[PDB]
Amino acid sequence: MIHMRTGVIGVGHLGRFHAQKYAAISQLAGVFDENAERAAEVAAELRCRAFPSVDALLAEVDAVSIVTPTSTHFAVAEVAMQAGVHCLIEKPFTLDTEEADALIGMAQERHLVLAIGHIKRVHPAIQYLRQAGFGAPRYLEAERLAPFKPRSLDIDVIMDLMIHDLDLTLLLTGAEPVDVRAVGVAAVTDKADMATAWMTLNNGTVANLAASRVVREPARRMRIFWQDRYASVDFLNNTLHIYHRVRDEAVDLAKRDALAAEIEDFLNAIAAHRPVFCDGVAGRRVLAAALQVRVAVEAFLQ
């Protein structure tokens, strides 16, 4: 239980849950939303306030989640940081990278914690593998396959699905992309519905990343290979399996609330000057990588 004044801006499908976690782990001041009925019922559920403006809310909190539509993340975030408040921004960070850089600089001049909601970083398998001190992997092979749900249009498979494994690749390798080839297939829209990236980093690591949003049977698999070790991560069987040149160690992992852990980490970074689980600089790096992937795809697709 952290002692901090917290609020959420944007309480839709995902901001409502942010609000709930804040209410359980902090003193949630209240919420703001452009839809007023929706903010009203969120505030009724959590015995908190539905503030009548962004600035009413901001004058009364130390920290907020920004869970507004992506195109708005820069605008809202400026007002929040301008007001001296800490921000956890839900993924994706921003639309283009100059917005991202602006926000990083604001946070740096104002000594505010800027966090990006790249949730897989708090997954227990990713924590286990990082504490294992295995080094940078040689080969990464991810597939993220989703059912097409009725709101899945304008959801670009790269900025929505693939970005999770792009982020993981940057994190576990610590390297930046130097070559990016990609294929895409636009089936329903002209936007990509299936995209697969073959990506090479300056440390010579290869990541082979496949996302597809028009899929019938979901799947969140990632296989990571060092020289003498191999992990398979199954994010929805929630299993982690490590093999040593074979020996098959099944790591059993505690299930835990991923968003709760994310928010606890954001607040704990504010409170103790800890590095947060994913700062704005990392969010910018993954945003640039996904933009590369998309440029390569729209090259392929023409």
From 98, 117, 136, give the residue that closes a domain: 117
Please tell me whether the peptide bond between 137 and the residue prior to it is cis, using omega within 30 degrees of 0: no
Provide the domain limits for residue 206: 118-302
Residues 195 and 228 in one domain: yes
Q: In angstroms, what is the resolution?
A: 2.7
The reply to whether 167 and 188 lie within a common domain is yes
15 exposure class (CB count in 10 Å sphere: 0-12, 13-18, 19+): buried
Task: Please answer whether residues 224 and 140 qualify as being in contact, where contact means their C-beta atoms are separated by less than 8 angstroms.
Answer: yes
Looking at the structure, tell me whether residues 248 and 237 fall in a common domain. Answer: yes
Q: Of 90, 117, 144, which closes a domain?
A: 117
Q: Is 129 a known ligand-binding residue?
A: no
- CA 101/CA 97 separation, integer angstroms: 6
Q: How many domains does the chain have?
A: 2
Same domain, 226 and 86: no
Instruction: Report CA torsion sign: 237, 243, 246, 249.
Output: negative
Is 76 in the same domain as 197? no
123 labeled binding residue: no
Are 71 and 150 part of one and the same domain? Answer: no
- Of the three residues 79, 97, 117, the one that is the final residue of a domain is 117
**Do residues 150 and 70 share a domain?**
no
- Check whether residue 209 and residue 69 sit in a common domain: no
Q: Could you tell me if 286 and 184 lie in one domain?
A: yes
46 and 127 housed in the same domain: no
Question: 38: annotated binding-site residue?
Answer: yes
Query: Is residue 61 domain-shared with residue 141, that is, in the same domain?
Result: no
Q: Are residues 257 and 288 in the same domain?
A: yes
